[PDB]
Design an enzyme around this catalytic site. Structure first.
Site, short mmCIF file in Angstrom:
data_model
loop_
_atom_site.label_atom_id
_atom_site.label_comp_id
_atom_site.label_asym_id
_atom_site.label_seq_id
_atom_site.Cartn_x
_atom_site.Cartn_y
_atom_site.Cartn_z
N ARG A 79 7.05 27.41 -1.63
CA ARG A 79 7.00 28.26 -2.86
C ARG A 79 8.45 28.39 -3.35
N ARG A 80 9.36 28.78 -2.46
CA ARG A 80 10.80 28.77 -2.81
C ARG A 80 11.32 27.37 -2.45
NH1 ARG A 80 13.20 34.00 -0.74
NH2 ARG A 80 11.65 35.64 -1.15
N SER B 222 8.58 30.12 4.77
CA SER B 222 8.31 31.15 3.79
C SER B 222 8.57 32.51 4.42
CB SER B 222 6.88 31.07 3.26
OG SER B 222 6.67 32.03 2.25
N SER C 138 8.17 36.40 4.08
CA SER C 138 7.47 37.49 3.41
C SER C 138 8.21 38.79 3.69
CB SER C 138 6.01 37.61 3.86
OG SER C 138 5.19 38.21 2.85
N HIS D 171 7.92 39.14 8.49
CA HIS D 171 7.69 38.01 9.38
C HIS D 171 8.03 36.74 8.62
CE1 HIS D 171 3.48 38.49 7.59
NE2 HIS D 171 3.85 37.28 7.19
N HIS E 295 0.91 33.00 7.08
CA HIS E 295 0.89 34.46 6.95
C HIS E 295 -0.29 35.12 7.65
CE1 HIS E 295 4.29 34.25 4.36
NE2 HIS E 295 3.65 33.55 3.44
C1 GIT Z 1 3.79 29.99 2.56
C2 GIT Z 1 2.86 30.82 1.66
O1 GIT Z 1 3.21 31.86 1.20
C3 GIT Z 1 1.47 30.30 1.33
N1 GIT Z 1 1.58 29.31 0.27
N2 GIT Z 1 2.28 28.15 0.39
N3 GIT Z 1 2.17 27.48 -0.80
C4 GIT Z 1 1.42 28.21 -1.64
C5 GIT Z 1 1.07 27.78 -3.09
C6 GIT Z 1 -0.21 27.92 -3.63
C7 GIT Z 1 -0.48 27.52 -4.94
C8 GIT Z 1 0.54 26.97 -5.72
C9 GIT Z 1 1.81 26.84 -5.19
C10 GIT Z 1 2.08 27.24 -3.88
C11 GIT Z 1 1.04 29.38 -0.95
C12 GIT Z 1 0.18 30.53 -1.53
O2 GIT Z 1 -0.83 30.98 -0.65
C13 GIT Z 1 -1.81 31.82 -1.22
O3 GIT Z 1 -1.76 33.00 -1.11
N4 GIT Z 1 -2.92 31.22 -1.95
C14 GIT Z 1 -3.92 30.44 -1.24
C15 GIT Z 1 -4.07 29.03 -1.83
C16 GIT Z 1 -3.16 28.05 -1.48
C17 GIT Z 1 -3.29 26.77 -2.01
C18 GIT Z 1 -4.32 26.49 -2.87
C19 GIT Z 1 -5.24 27.47 -3.22
C20 GIT Z 1 -5.12 28.74 -2.70
#
Ligand code: GIT
Ligand code: GIT
Lengths: 213, 213
Positions: free
Chosen positions: B130-131, B117, B119, B122, B48
């Site tokens: 996450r999904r 992912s 958003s 984009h 992102h």
């Molecule tokens: C693709 C995204 O939107 C970014 N992302 N991918 N996986 C995660 C995530 C984080 C924690 C728990 C489950 C999934 C993310 C989220 O990205 C963030 O905004 N947070 C930053 C972060 C990521 C990992 C660990 C600590 C902070």
């Protein structure tokens, strides 16, 4: 804009725990085996890459629960790479537990290279350790690292303090090569659980450490 | 020493699966919601970071099981960073499953950025999605990616093929910044299990893919 971040970093942790049977039989390393070996200082690198030397091991000592080691991350070239990447990581920007002062570089190393691995030829900073209890604790003062480890006695701490108070830039690798071994770390099975486990074992917590696991 | 590695790479995968309730209620994205939105092409970046644009989304299509997308990783500056890091990674040097030709760059991307992912603003290449079902499949031919996805029909594949056959370097980030978001990926809980799961879901396997999970 004073860069008191690319200054030395120290790291301490158990290289091997005398109360933990390895997962594989080939990791077994017993007290008598280790003490014979304690009988020209030995180097500290990243993921066993001899091209990626970042500093040196400043003191090792065998104690009741295992083999403790405390190194110094001195390489200017490496610490500067670490400084630029930590400005760009969300985990670092969230900072340590409130009481601890933010240290972007010490946190980044805490996150990336959370384990210690002894191959003595040299000590490596891994993502995780293969042996349990190999938790790598980073800090700006040699005495600060040691004191996170409850199992260590005062007399233990004094044996180490005697050693760490006892030729160019040794890092020939670069950002692209650390990038390279980063994706390899992603595919280590049960990386966090293994790390949360070593945390409980050697007695360290994150409310007293920069440990990110 | 011909560098037929820093040539385009395509990536395809489900942005969202219509048979999977999110873990959080905020990820819910239904068919009717998505189709209204299908009504100037939209960019593809890393975690992102708008400064880290690597290419663009070349085709999206809603099908029976979800929303499929297929992008192109065109940025010379980014692909070159990826090429140098993959020379330095053990996971890449082990190569894909025997039948598949080794592609150091396609493997590296497969390992690092295994998820998709959304958003639309984009699409991002994450470490995981996450999904669930957001598995990112990389390849050198647009038709090669699509064909890894059994749930896609011939007619589905033809809707996409119509789109992907329908201003400088957009990557202003660098090695240090990708290094930065790499350690963040390490601390995603149950990263592999989540990924092994999306693999089973959308029907992809590694004996037919560069997927490293
Ligand atoms: C693709 C995204 O939107 C970014 N992302 N991918 N996986 C995660 C995530 C984080 C924690 C728990 C489950 C999934 C993310 C989220 O990205 C963030 O905004 N947070 C930053 C972060 C990521 C990992 C660990 C600590 C902070
Ligand atoms: C500190 C080390 O000795 C390097 N290392 N740290 N953790 C592992 C590991 C790998 C797989 C399963 C459990 C633990 C390693 C091993 O490093 C290697 O020689 N293999 C490269 C590799 C690492 C991770 C994934 C794939 C290949």
């Amino acid at each position: 804009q004073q860069s008191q971040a690319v200054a030395p970093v120290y790291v301490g942790g158990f290289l091997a725990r005398y109360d933990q049977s390895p997962d594989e039989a080939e990791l077994l390393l017993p007290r008598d085996v280790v003490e014979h070996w304690l009988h020209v200082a030995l180097p500290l690198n990243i993921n066993h890459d001899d091209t990626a030397v970042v500093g040196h091991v400043a003191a090792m000592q065998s104690v009741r629960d295992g083999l403790f080691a405390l190194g110094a991350v001195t390489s200017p070239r490496f610490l500067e790479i670490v400084r630029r990447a930590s400005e760009k990581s969300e985990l670092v920007s969230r900072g340590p537990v409130s009481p601890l002062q933010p240290d972007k570089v010490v946190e980044f190393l805490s996150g990336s290279y959370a384990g210690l691995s002894l191959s003595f030829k040299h000590v490596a900073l891994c993502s995780v350790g293969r042996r349990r209890g190999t938790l790598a604790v980073y800090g700006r003062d040699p005495e600060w690292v040691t004191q996170r480890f409850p199992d260590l006695t005062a007399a233990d701490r004094d044996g180490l303090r005697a050693q760490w108070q006892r030729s160019g830039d040794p890092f020939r690798s670069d950002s692209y090569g650390l990038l390279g071994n980063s994706v390899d770390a992603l595919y280590i099975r049960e990386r966090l659980p293994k790390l949360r486990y070593d945390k409980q074992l050697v007695g360290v917590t994150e409310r007293e450490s920069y440990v990110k696991a």
